Amino acid sequence: KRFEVKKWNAVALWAWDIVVDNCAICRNHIMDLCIECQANQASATSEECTVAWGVCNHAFHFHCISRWLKTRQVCPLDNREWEFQKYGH
Amino acid sequence: KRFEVKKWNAVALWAWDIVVDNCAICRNHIMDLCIECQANQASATSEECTVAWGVCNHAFHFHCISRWLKTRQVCPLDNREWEFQKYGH
Amino acid sequence: CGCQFTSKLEGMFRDMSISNTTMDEFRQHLQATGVSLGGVDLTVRVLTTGYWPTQSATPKCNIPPAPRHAFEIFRRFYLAKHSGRQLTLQHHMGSADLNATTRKHILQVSTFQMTILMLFNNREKYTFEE
Amino acid sequence: CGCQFTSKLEGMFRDMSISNTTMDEFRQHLQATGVSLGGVDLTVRVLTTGYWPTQSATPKCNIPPAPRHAFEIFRRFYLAKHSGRQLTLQHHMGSADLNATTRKHILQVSTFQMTILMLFNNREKYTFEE
Ligand SMILES: [Zn+2]
Ligand SMILES: [Zn+2]
Ligand SMILES: [Zn+2]
Ligand SMILES: [Zn+2]
Ligand SMILES: [Zn+2]
Numbered sequence: 306k307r308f309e310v311k312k313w314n315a316v317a318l319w320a321w322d323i324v325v326d327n328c329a330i331c332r333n334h335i336m337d338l339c340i341e342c343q344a345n346q347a348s349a350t351s352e353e354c355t356v357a358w359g360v361c362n363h364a365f366h367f368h369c370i371s372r373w374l375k376t377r378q379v380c381p382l383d384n385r386e387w388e389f390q391k392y393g394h
Numbered sequence: 395k396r397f398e399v400k401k402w403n404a405v406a407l408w409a410w411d412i413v414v415d416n417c418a419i420c421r422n423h424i425m426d427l428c429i430e431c432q433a434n435q436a437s438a439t440s441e442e443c444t445v446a447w448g449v450c451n452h453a454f455h456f457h458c459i460s461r462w463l464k465t466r467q468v469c470p471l472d473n474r475e476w477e478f479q480k481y482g483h
Numbered sequence: 484c485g486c487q488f489t490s491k492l493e494g495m496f497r498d499m500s501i502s503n504t505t506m507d508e509f510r511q512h513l514q515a516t517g518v519s520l521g522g523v524d525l526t527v528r529v530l531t532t533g534y535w536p537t538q539s540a541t542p543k544c545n546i547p548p549a550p551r552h553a554f555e556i557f558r559r560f561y562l563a564k565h566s567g568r569q570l571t572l573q574h575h576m577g578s579a580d581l582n583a584t585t586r587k588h589i590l591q592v593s594t595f596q597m598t599i600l601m602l603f604n605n606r607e608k609y610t611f612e613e
Numbered sequence: 614c615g616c617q618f619t620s621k622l623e624g625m626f627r628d629m630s631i632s633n634t635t636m637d638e639f640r641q642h643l644q645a646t647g648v649s650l651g652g653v654d655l656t657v658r659v660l661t662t663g664y665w666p667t668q669s670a671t672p673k674c675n676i677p678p679a680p681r682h683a684f685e686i687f688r689r690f691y692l693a694k695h696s697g698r699q700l701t702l703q704h705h706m707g708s709a710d711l712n713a714t715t716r717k718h719i720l721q722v723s724t725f726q727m728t729i730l731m732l733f734n735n736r737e738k739y740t741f742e743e
């Protein structure tokens with residue numbers, strides 16, 4: 306051949322079993338609102354109902370784990386202190 | 395085809411990095427005597443200079459780790475309590 | 484007989500637990516990947532050298548290519564998930580279910596006749612020399 | 614600034630440490646199997662979604678077959694050893710060294726021109742439509 310690849314420097318991103326189809330706290334989805342918001346509008350009045358990403362690569366609705374912080378303080382699928390490293394998908 | 399295999403029940407045996415070519419205590423081999431025996435006969439007078447297998451699947455000369463039990467009591471390549479589950483290769 | 488001897492038996496049972504846990508884990512990971520998995524039901528058991536003595540001299544032969552590929556994939560999975568160890572091949576242990584074919588009757592081979600019957604499948608009319 | 618965003622930077626450095634450790638581990642495990650001629654040289658890293666934002670929309674395009682096989686190998690190895698590290702496929706990151714051939718001068722592609730040049734290698738005289 307005329308051109309051949311010798312080295313590769315790909316970067317691999319990983320995500321845990323967040324179950325994009327069932328929120329691990331509310332069991333609706335990784336998007337499309339939550340149990341306490343339901344309808345899309347539901348008198349939104351600004352604020353937000355996006356996805357929250359932790360330091361453990363877990364994803365839930367911001368509302369779900371914001372409320373869950375009052376019940377416990379360690380991400381339910383593990384035993385790690387939950388951070389708020391990202392907001393939204 | 396006339397005969398096709400559907401199920402298989404193979405049993406896999408595993409061994410740790412015992413370094414069959416260098417004893418992790420004396421650095422001679424996994425066989426062929428040890429540092430304090432050297433020559434094959436060396437006034438053997440019965441007794442034994444075989445291989446000792448632990449509960450952690452580590453293998454050294456019986457003489458080497460028998461002497462090493464006086465220096466420490468946790469297998470050097472790990473932090474496990476060393477057993478004597480087998481004698482010889 | 485004393486707990487001094489039953490301790491090894493308890494360790495053997497712990498090894499059995501480890502083997503079945505690793506088996507279900509490898510099945511779950513094959514559900515996501517499992518490229519080389521010729522043996523459909525790869526029931527692979529992981530044991531430790533100390534508990535179970537070597538049969539005679541750790542045998543080797545013309546293992547069937549589909550079970551060869553299945554065992555290779557299982558060993559690669561086991562050497563990755565459980566790192567720090569090496570997997571050996573042997574034949575004097577285990578069993579298998581051979582699906583034969585008027586109905587489809589499934590036979591059984593105890594990891595001894597798999598190579599001979601695979602050679603027969605590749606080409607019949609063999610003998611001891613073959 | 615204080616221990617508000619510097620903690621995030623320390624976490625990013627920890628992620629860098631994790632990435633290089635996983636890289637050397639995957640190189641060591643590649644030294645073991647060596648099946649196909651696609652893993653000749655691999656400086657692949659492992660990052661977490663939270664630390665590093667997604668580039669645009671995670672591009673998913675035709676990758677070259679040798680690099681494609683290499684990435685498959687990497688993904689499988691990771692999901693087995695560090696079970697839970699499902700490698701997503703992206704292209705807006707990384708680089709590569711293309712060995713061209715009067716001497717043998719090695720070019721460099723930042724994971725963008727690899728697919729186009731691979732298509733050229735498969736068949737020259739292409740255009741935008743191709
Ligand atoms: Zn939810
Ligand atoms: Zn909501
Ligand atoms: Zn978590
Ligand atoms: Zn020694
Ligand atoms: Zn000796």
Ligand SMILES: [Zn+2]
Nearest residue numbers: 450452469472
């Ligand atoms: Zn040990």
